[PDB]
Protein backbone atom coordinates (compact mmCIF):
# COMPACT_ATOMS: atom_id res chain seq x y z
CA UNK A 1 0.00 0.00 0.00
CA UNK A 2 1.15 3.55 -0.81
CA UNK A 3 -0.24 6.95 -1.91
CA UNK A 4 -1.08 8.03 -5.49
CA UNK A 5 -4.78 7.15 -5.88
CA UNK A 6 -6.28 5.21 -8.78
CA UNK A 7 -9.98 4.24 -8.69
CA UNK A 8 -9.64 1.72 -5.86
CA UNK A 9 -11.45 -1.45 -6.84
CA UNK A 10 -10.44 -4.15 -4.39
CA UNK A 11 -10.61 -7.73 -5.61
CA UNK A 12 -10.70 -10.86 -3.44
CA UNK A 13 -11.74 -14.49 -3.01
CA UNK A 14 -14.07 -16.13 -0.60
CA UNK A 15 -13.88 -19.58 1.00
CA UNK A 16 -16.48 -22.27 1.26
CA UNK A 17 -15.86 -22.12 5.02
CA UNK A 18 -14.08 -19.89 7.52
CA UNK A 19 -12.20 -22.27 9.78
CA UNK A 20 -11.35 -21.70 13.43
CA UNK A 21 -9.57 -24.01 15.81
CA UNK A 22 -9.51 -23.53 19.54
CA UNK A 23 -6.54 -25.25 21.14
CA UNK A 24 -5.90 -25.55 24.91
CA UNK A 25 -5.57 -22.13 26.51
CA UNK A 26 -4.56 -21.43 30.08
CA UNK A 27 -6.58 -18.98 32.14
CA UNK A 28 -4.56 -16.15 33.64
CA UNK A 29 -4.87 -15.57 37.38
CA UNK A 30 -3.37 -12.62 39.21
CA UNK A 31 -3.33 -10.52 42.38
CA UNK A 32 -4.36 -6.88 42.12
CA UNK A 33 -5.07 -3.70 44.05
CA UNK A 34 -6.63 -5.80 46.79
CA UNK A 35 -8.60 -7.57 44.09
CA UNK A 36 -8.30 -10.94 42.46
CA UNK A 37 -7.85 -10.76 38.70
CA UNK A 38 -8.74 -13.30 36.10
CA UNK A 39 -8.50 -12.91 32.40
CA UNK A 40 -9.55 -15.68 30.08
CA UNK A 41 -11.90 -16.52 27.27
CA UNK A 42 -14.29 -19.51 27.21
CA UNK A 43 -17.16 -20.76 25.02
CA UNK A 44 -20.38 -19.79 26.78
CA UNK A 45 -22.99 -20.63 24.15
CA UNK A 46 -23.95 -23.04 21.35
CA UNK A 47 -26.35 -21.68 18.78
CA UNK A 48 -28.41 -24.42 17.16
CA UNK A 49 -31.25 -22.96 15.08
CA UNK A 50 -34.57 -24.67 14.45
CA UNK A 51 -36.55 -24.99 11.26
CA UNK A 52 -39.76 -23.96 13.05
CA UNK A 53 -38.77 -20.29 13.58
CA UNK A 54 -36.12 -17.65 14.51
CA UNK A 55 -34.42 -18.14 17.85
CA UNK A 56 -33.87 -15.50 20.51
CA UNK A 57 -31.75 -16.43 23.57
CA UNK A 58 -30.61 -14.41 26.55
CA UNK A 59 -27.39 -14.67 28.59
CA UNK A 60 -27.09 -12.81 31.88
CA UNK A 61 -23.72 -11.15 32.36
CA UNK A 62 -22.80 -12.63 35.70
CA UNK A 63 -19.63 -14.24 37.15
CA UNK A 64 -21.28 -17.55 38.08
CA UNK A 65 -22.72 -18.02 34.60
CA UNK A 66 -24.48 -21.38 34.36
CA UNK A 67 -27.93 -22.64 33.32
CA UNK A 68 -30.53 -21.95 36.08
CA UNK A 69 -31.13 -25.27 37.80
CA UNK A 70 -34.83 -25.24 37.23
CA UNK A 71 -37.17 -26.53 34.55
CA UNK A 72 -38.30 -24.36 31.63
CA UNK A 73 -35.29 -21.95 32.20
CA UNK A 74 -35.43 -18.30 31.22
CA UNK A 75 -31.67 -18.07 30.51
CA UNK A 76 -28.76 -19.68 28.62
CA UNK A 77 -24.98 -19.68 28.81
CA UNK A 78 -22.41 -21.57 30.90
CA UNK A 79 -18.98 -20.14 31.73
CA UNK A 80 -17.41 -23.04 33.74
CA UNK A 81 -14.05 -21.71 34.85
CA UNK A 82 -15.31 -18.17 35.43
CA UNK A 83 -18.07 -19.63 37.56
CA UNK A 84 -15.85 -21.84 39.70
CA UNK A 85 -13.47 -19.01 40.37
CA UNK A 86 -16.19 -16.48 41.09
CA UNK A 87 -18.02 -18.85 43.39
CA UNK A 88 -15.35 -17.96 45.96
CA UNK A 89 -15.99 -14.20 46.00
CA UNK A 90 -18.93 -11.96 46.85
CA UNK A 91 -18.07 -8.95 44.75
CA UNK A 92 -17.02 -8.44 41.14
CA UNK A 93 -16.43 -5.68 38.57
CA UNK A 94 -15.54 -5.89 34.91
CA UNK A 95 -12.36 -4.62 33.26
CA UNK A 96 -12.67 -6.10 29.81
CA UNK A 97 -15.54 -7.99 28.23
CA UNK A 98 -16.49 -8.85 24.67
CA UNK A 99 -18.31 -11.63 22.86
CA UNK A 100 -16.81 -13.16 19.75
CA UNK A 101 -18.81 -15.03 17.14
CA UNK A 102 -17.12 -18.27 16.16
CA UNK A 103 -18.87 -19.65 13.03
CA UNK A 104 -19.31 -23.39 12.55
CA UNK A 105 -21.04 -23.39 9.16
CA UNK A 106 -20.46 -22.94 5.41
CA UNK A 107 -20.54 -19.54 3.68
CA UNK A 108 -23.65 -21.12 2.06
CA UNK A 109 -25.85 -20.84 5.15
CA UNK A 110 -27.99 -17.66 4.81
CA UNK A 111 -29.63 -15.53 7.44
CA UNK A 112 -28.01 -13.37 10.08
CA UNK A 113 -26.84 -13.69 13.62
CA UNK A 114 -27.47 -10.87 16.05
CA UNK A 115 -25.78 -9.85 19.29
CA UNK A 116 -27.05 -7.05 21.49
CA UNK A 117 -26.39 -5.95 25.05
CA UNK A 118 -29.11 -4.49 27.29
CA UNK A 119 -27.94 -2.44 30.33
CA UNK A 120 -31.20 -2.66 32.27
CA UNK A 121 -33.05 -5.87 32.86
CA UNK A 122 -36.28 -3.92 32.98
CA UNK A 123 -36.01 -3.45 29.24
CA UNK A 124 -38.70 -4.74 26.94
CA UNK A 125 -36.91 -7.83 25.47
CA UNK A 126 -37.58 -8.08 21.71
CA UNK A 127 -39.36 -11.00 20.07
CA UNK A 128 -38.51 -10.06 16.49
CA UNK A 129 -35.20 -10.72 14.84
CA UNK A 130 -35.77 -7.41 13.07
CA UNK A 131 -36.61 -5.44 16.22
CA UNK A 132 -33.61 -6.95 17.96
CA UNK A 133 -31.04 -5.81 15.44
CA UNK A 134 -32.51 -2.29 15.18
CA UNK A 135 -29.51 -0.77 16.88
CA UNK A 136 -26.52 -1.22 19.21
CA UNK A 137 -25.92 -4.68 17.82
CA UNK A 138 -23.42 -6.81 15.98
CA UNK A 139 -25.07 -8.26 12.91
CA UNK A 140 -23.44 -10.61 10.42
CA UNK A 141 -23.86 -13.64 8.28
CA UNK A 142 -23.64 -16.91 10.28
CA UNK A 143 -20.62 -18.08 8.20
CA UNK A 144 -18.40 -15.03 8.85
CA UNK A 145 -15.59 -15.20 11.39
CA UNK A 146 -13.49 -12.87 13.46
CA UNK A 147 -16.23 -10.48 14.43
CA UNK A 148 -16.67 -9.51 18.08
CA UNK A 149 -19.18 -7.48 20.05
CA UNK A 150 -18.24 -5.32 23.00
CA UNK A 151 -20.91 -4.37 25.54
CA UNK A 152 -20.89 -0.66 26.41
CA UNK A 153 -19.65 -0.86 30.02
CA UNK A 154 -17.71 1.46 32.34
CA UNK A 155 -14.39 -0.31 32.75
CA UNK A 156 -12.19 2.71 33.45
CA UNK A 157 -11.21 4.11 36.83
CA UNK A 158 -13.18 2.14 39.38
CA UNK A 159 -16.37 0.64 37.91
CA UNK A 160 -19.30 0.02 40.27
CA UNK A 161 -18.95 -3.09 42.41
CA UNK A 162 -21.57 -5.70 41.65
CA UNK A 163 -22.40 -8.65 43.89
CA UNK A 164 -21.92 -12.30 42.94
CA UNK A 165 -24.86 -14.68 43.15
CA UNK A 166 -25.77 -18.16 41.88
CA UNK A 167 -27.31 -18.56 38.44
CA UNK A 168 -30.62 -20.07 39.59
CA UNK A 169 -31.08 -17.68 42.54
CA UNK A 170 -30.32 -14.82 40.17
CA UNK A 171 -32.82 -16.21 37.69
CA UNK A 172 -35.28 -16.03 40.58
CA UNK A 173 -34.65 -12.36 41.39
CA UNK A 174 -37.10 -9.64 40.35
CA UNK A 175 -36.03 -7.20 37.67
CA UNK A 176 -35.42 -4.16 39.87
CA UNK A 177 -33.12 -6.43 41.89
CA UNK A 178 -31.12 -8.14 39.11
CA UNK A 179 -29.32 -4.85 38.59
CA UNK A 180 -27.26 -5.18 41.76
CA UNK A 181 -25.95 -8.55 40.52
CA UNK A 182 -25.33 -7.98 36.83
CA UNK A 183 -24.07 -5.42 34.32
CA UNK A 184 -26.73 -6.46 31.86
CA UNK A 185 -27.70 -9.26 29.51
CA UNK A 186 -26.61 -10.37 26.09
CA UNK A 187 -29.48 -11.25 23.76
CA UNK A 188 -28.48 -13.63 21.00
CA UNK A 189 -30.81 -13.69 18.00
CA UNK A 190 -30.32 -16.08 15.10
CA UNK A 191 -32.47 -16.56 12.03
CA UNK A 192 -33.92 -19.98 11.25
CA UNK A 193 -32.57 -22.35 8.62
CA UNK A 194 -33.78 -24.86 6.07
CA UNK A 195 -32.88 -27.64 8.48
CA UNK A 196 -31.39 -28.45 11.91
CA UNK A 197 -27.93 -26.86 12.08
CA UNK A 198 -25.49 -25.45 14.63
CA UNK A 199 -24.65 -22.04 13.23
CA UNK A 200 -21.78 -21.49 15.63
CA UNK A 201 -20.34 -20.87 19.07
CA UNK A 202 -20.29 -17.68 21.10
CA UNK A 203 -16.93 -17.02 22.81
CA UNK A 204 -16.69 -14.74 25.84
CA UNK A 205 -13.39 -12.84 26.13
CA UNK A 206 -12.97 -11.24 29.56
CA UNK A 207 -11.13 -9.75 32.53
CA UNK A 208 -13.06 -9.71 35.83
CA UNK A 209 -11.86 -8.53 39.24
CA UNK A 210 -13.29 -10.12 42.39
CA UNK A 211 -13.06 -9.76 46.13
CA UNK A 212 -14.63 -10.82 49.44
CA UNK A 213 -14.07 -14.50 50.24
CA UNK A 214 -17.07 -16.89 50.50
CA UNK A 215 -17.57 -20.53 51.57
CA UNK A 216 -19.46 -23.37 49.82
CA UNK A 217 -22.17 -22.32 47.26
Task: Please pick, from the candidates 47, 153, 162, 202, the single residue that binds RNA as defined by CB under 7 A.
Answer: 153
Which listed option, Ca ion, a second copy, RNA, none, makes contact with residue 56 (CB within 5 to 8 Å by class)?
none
Cβ contacts of 35 within 8 Å, gap of 6 or more: 209, 210, 211
Q: Does 185 bind a second copy (CB under 8 A)?
A: no
Tell me how far CA of residue 130 lies from CA of 120, 123, 133, 134, in angstroms: 20, 17, 6, 6
Instruction: Out of 59, 129, 187, 188, point to the residue binding a second copy (CB under 8 A).
Output: 129
Is residue 72 within the footprint of a second copy (CB under 8 A)?
no
Residue 66 near residue 85 (C-beta atoms within 8 A)? no
Q: Is 167 helix (H, G, I), strand (E, B) or coil?
A: helix
CB nearer to RNA: give 86 or 142.
Answer: 86
Contact partner, 209, from RNA, Ca ion, a second copy, none, Cβ < 5-8 Å per class: RNA
Q: With helix as H, strand as E and coil as C, how does 46-95 read?
A: EEEECCCCCEEEEEECCCCCCCCCCCCCCCCCCCHHHHHHHCCEEEEEEE
Q: How far is the CB of 167 from RNA (least distance, A)?
A: 22
* Closest distance to Ca ion from the beta carbon of 119 (Å): 15
Q: Does 36 bind RNA (CB under 7 A)?
A: yes
Closer by beta carbon to a second copy, 70 or else 152: 152
Which residues ranging from 46 to 75 are in contact with RNA (CB under 7 A)?
none
Shortest spacing between CB 200 and a second copy, in angstroms: 8
- Long-range contacts of residues 80-84, Cβ cutoff 8 Å, at least 24 apart: 80/42, 81/27, 81/40, 81/42, 82/38, 82/40, 82/42, 82/204, 82/206, 82/208, 83/167
Q: Segment 97-116, which members bind RNA (CB under 7 A)?
A: 97-98
Size of the site for a second copy (CB under 8 A): 133
The answer to whether 2 contacts a second copy (rule: CB under 8 A) is no
Closest CA to 65 of 36, 99, 24, 31: 99
**Taking CB within 5 to 8 Å according to partner kind, which of Ca ion, a second copy, RNA, none is near residue 45?**
a second copy
Q: Which of 156, 195, 196, 215 binds RNA (CB under 7 A)?
A: 156
Contact 49, 32 (CB under 8 A): no
The binding site for Ca ion (CB under 5 A) comprises: 177
Amino acid sequence: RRRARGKSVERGSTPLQYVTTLGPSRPRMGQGQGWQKLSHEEIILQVNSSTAADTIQTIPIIPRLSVPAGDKPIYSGSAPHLRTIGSAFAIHRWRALSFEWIPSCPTTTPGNLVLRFYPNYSTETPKTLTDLMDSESLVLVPSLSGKTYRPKIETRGNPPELRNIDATAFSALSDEDKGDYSVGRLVVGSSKQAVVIQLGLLRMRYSAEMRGATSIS
